[PDB]
Coordinates of all heavy atoms in Angstrom, one line a residue:
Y1 N -77.8 -78.2 7.4 CA -76.8 -78.0 8.6 C -76.5 -76.6 8.9 O -76.3 -76.3 10.1 CB -75.6 -78.8 8.3 CG -75.7 -80.3 8.4 CD1 -74.6 -81.2 8.1 CD2 -77.0 -80.9 8.7 CE1 -74.8 -82.5 8.2 CE2 -77.1 -82.3 8.7 CZ -76.0 -83.1 8.5 OH -76.1 -84.5 8.5
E2 N -76.4 -75.7 7.9 CA -76.2 -74.3 8.3 C -77.3 -73.7 9.1 O -77.2 -73.0 10.1 CB -75.9 -73.4 7.0 CG -74.6 -73.7 6.4 CD -73.4 -73.1 7.1 OE1 -73.5 -72.5 8.1 OE2 -72.3 -73.3 6.5
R3 N -78.6 -74.1 8.7 CA -79.7 -73.7 9.5 C -79.7 -74.3 10.8 O -80.1 -73.6 11.8 CB -81.0 -74.0 8.7 CG -81.4 -73.1 7.6 CD -82.7 -73.5 7.0 NE -83.8 -73.5 8.0 CZ -84.9 -74.2 7.9 NH1 -85.1 -74.9 6.9 NH2 -85.8 -74.1 8.9
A4 N -79.3 -75.6 11.0 CA -79.3 -76.2 12.3 C -78.3 -75.5 13.2 O -78.6 -75.2 14.3 CB -78.9 -77.7 12.1
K5 N -77.1 -75.2 12.7 CA -76.1 -74.6 13.5 C -76.6 -73.2 14.0 O -76.4 -72.9 15.2 CB -74.8 -74.4 12.7 CG -73.7 -73.9 13.5 CD -72.4 -73.8 12.8 CE -72.4 -72.8 11.8 NZ -71.3 -71.8 12.0
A6 N -77.3 -72.5 13.2 CA -77.8 -71.2 13.5 C -78.9 -71.3 14.6 O -78.9 -70.4 15.5 CB -78.4 -70.5 12.3
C7 N -79.7 -72.3 14.7 CA -80.6 -72.6 15.8 C -79.9 -72.7 17.1 O -80.3 -72.0 18.1 CB -81.4 -73.8 15.5 SG -82.7 -73.7 14.2
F8 N -78.8 -73.5 17.1 CA -78.1 -73.7 18.4 C -77.4 -72.4 18.8 O -77.3 -72.1 20.0 CB -77.2 -74.9 18.3 CG -77.9 -76.2 18.0 CD1 -77.7 -76.9 16.9 CD2 -78.8 -76.7 19.0 CE1 -78.4 -78.1 16.6 CE2 -79.5 -77.8 18.7 CZ -79.3 -78.6 17.6
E9 N -76.8 -71.7 17.8 CA -76.0 -70.5 18.0 C -76.9 -69.5 18.6 O -76.5 -68.7 19.5 CB -75.4 -70.1 16.7 CG -74.6 -68.8 16.8 CD -73.7 -68.5 15.6 OE1 -73.5 -69.4 14.8 OE2 -73.1 -67.4 15.5
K10 N -78.2 -69.4 18.2 CA -79.1 -68.4 18.8 C -79.2 -68.6 20.3 O -79.3 -67.6 21.0 CB -80.5 -68.6 18.1 CG -81.6 -67.7 18.6 CD -82.9 -68.1 18.0 CE -84.1 -67.3 18.6 NZ -85.4 -67.9 18.2
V11 N -79.2 -69.8 20.8 CA -79.3 -70.1 22.2 C -78.0 -69.7 22.9 O -78.0 -69.1 24.0 CB -79.6 -71.6 22.5 CG1 -79.6 -71.8 24.0 CG2 -81.0 -71.9 21.9
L12 N -76.9 -70.0 22.3 CA -75.6 -69.8 22.9 C -75.3 -68.3 23.0 O -74.5 -67.9 23.8 CB -74.5 -70.5 22.1 CG -74.5 -72.0 22.3 CD1 -73.5 -72.6 21.3 CD2 -74.2 -72.5 23.7
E13 N -75.9 -67.5 22.1 CA -75.7 -66.0 22.1 C -76.3 -65.4 23.4 O -76.0 -64.3 23.7 CB -76.2 -65.4 20.9 CG -75.3 -65.5 19.7 CD -76.0 -65.1 18.4 OE1 -77.2 -64.8 18.4 OE2 -75.3 -65.2 17.3
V14 N -77.2 -66.1 24.0 CA -77.8 -65.6 25.3 C -77.4 -66.4 26.5 O -77.3 -65.9 27.6 CB -79.3 -65.5 25.2 CG1 -79.7 -64.7 24.0 CG2 -79.9 -66.9 25.0
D15 N -77.0 -67.7 26.3 CA -76.7 -68.6 27.4 C -75.5 -69.5 26.9 O -75.6 -70.6 26.4 CB -77.9 -69.5 27.8 CG -77.7 -70.3 29.0 OD1 -76.7 -70.1 29.7 OD2 -78.5 -71.2 29.2
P16 N -74.3 -68.9 27.1 CA -73.1 -69.6 26.5 C -72.7 -70.9 27.1 O -71.9 -71.6 26.5 CB -72.0 -68.5 26.6 CG -72.4 -67.7 27.9 CD -73.9 -67.7 27.8
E17 N -73.2 -71.2 28.3 CA -72.9 -72.5 28.9 C -74.1 -73.5 28.9 O -74.2 -74.4 29.6 CB -72.4 -72.3 30.4 CG -71.2 -71.4 30.4 CD -70.5 -71.6 31.8 OE1 -71.2 -71.6 32.8 OE2 -69.2 -71.7 31.8
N18 N -75.1 -73.2 28.0 CA -76.2 -74.1 27.8 C -75.7 -75.5 27.3 O -75.2 -75.5 26.2 CB -77.2 -73.5 26.9 CG -78.4 -74.4 26.8 OD1 -78.6 -75.1 25.8 ND2 -79.2 -74.5 27.8
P19 N -75.9 -76.6 28.1 CA -75.3 -77.8 27.6 C -75.9 -78.3 26.3 O -75.1 -78.8 25.4 CB -75.6 -78.8 28.7 CG -75.7 -77.9 30.0 CD -76.4 -76.7 29.4
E20 N -77.2 -78.3 26.1 CA -77.8 -78.9 24.9 C -77.5 -78.2 23.7 O -77.1 -78.8 22.6 CB -79.3 -78.9 25.1 CG -80.1 -79.7 24.0 CD -81.6 -79.8 24.2 OE1 -82.0 -79.5 25.3 OE2 -82.2 -80.2 23.3
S21 N -77.6 -76.8 23.7 CA -77.2 -76.1 22.5 C -75.7 -76.1 22.2 O -75.3 -76.0 21.1 CB -77.7 -74.7 22.5 OG -77.2 -73.9 23.6
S22 N -74.9 -76.2 23.3 CA -73.5 -76.4 23.1 C -73.2 -77.7 22.3 O -72.4 -77.7 21.3 CB -72.7 -76.5 24.4 OG -71.4 -76.8 24.2
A23 N -73.9 -78.8 22.6 CA -73.8 -80.0 21.9 C -74.2 -79.9 20.4 O -73.5 -80.3 19.5 CB -74.6 -81.1 22.6
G24 N -75.4 -79.3 20.2 CA -76.0 -79.2 18.9 C -75.1 -78.3 18.0 O -74.9 -78.6 16.8
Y25 N -74.6 -77.2 18.6 CA -73.7 -76.3 17.8 C -72.4 -77.1 17.5 O -72.0 -77.0 16.3 CB -73.4 -75.1 18.7 CG -72.5 -74.1 18.0 CD1 -73.1 -73.2 17.1 CD2 -71.1 -74.1 18.1 CE1 -72.3 -72.3 16.4 CE2 -70.4 -73.2 17.4 CZ -71.0 -72.3 16.5 OH -70.2 -71.5 15.8
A26 N -71.9 -77.9 18.4 CA -70.6 -78.6 18.1 C -70.8 -79.6 17.0 O -69.9 -79.8 16.2 CB -70.0 -79.2 19.4
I27 N -71.9 -80.4 17.1 CA -72.1 -81.5 16.1 C -72.3 -80.9 14.7 O -71.8 -81.3 13.7 CB -73.2 -82.4 16.6 CG1 -72.9 -83.1 17.9 CG2 -73.6 -83.4 15.4 CD1 -74.1 -83.7 18.5
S28 N -73.2 -79.8 14.7 CA -73.4 -79.1 13.4 C -72.1 -78.6 12.8 O -71.8 -78.8 11.6 CB -74.4 -78.0 13.6 OG -75.7 -78.4 14.1
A29 N -71.3 -77.9 13.7 CA -70.0 -77.4 13.2 C -69.1 -78.5 12.8 O -68.3 -78.3 11.8 CB -69.4 -76.5 14.3
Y30 N -69.0 -79.6 13.5 CA -68.2 -80.7 13.1 C -68.6 -81.2 11.7 O -67.7 -81.5 10.9 CB -68.3 -81.8 14.2 CG -67.6 -83.1 13.8 CD1 -66.2 -83.2 14.1 CD2 -68.2 -84.1 13.2 CE1 -65.5 -84.4 13.7 CE2 -67.5 -85.3 12.8 CZ -66.2 -85.4 13.1 OH -65.5 -86.5 12.7

């Protein structure tokens, strides 16, 4: 899960309103 979160975070660091990575980041963080 730490690796998963980092995948989605990589997208959000360039596109902070990306819906899909926002979801994956949130679920991983949850």
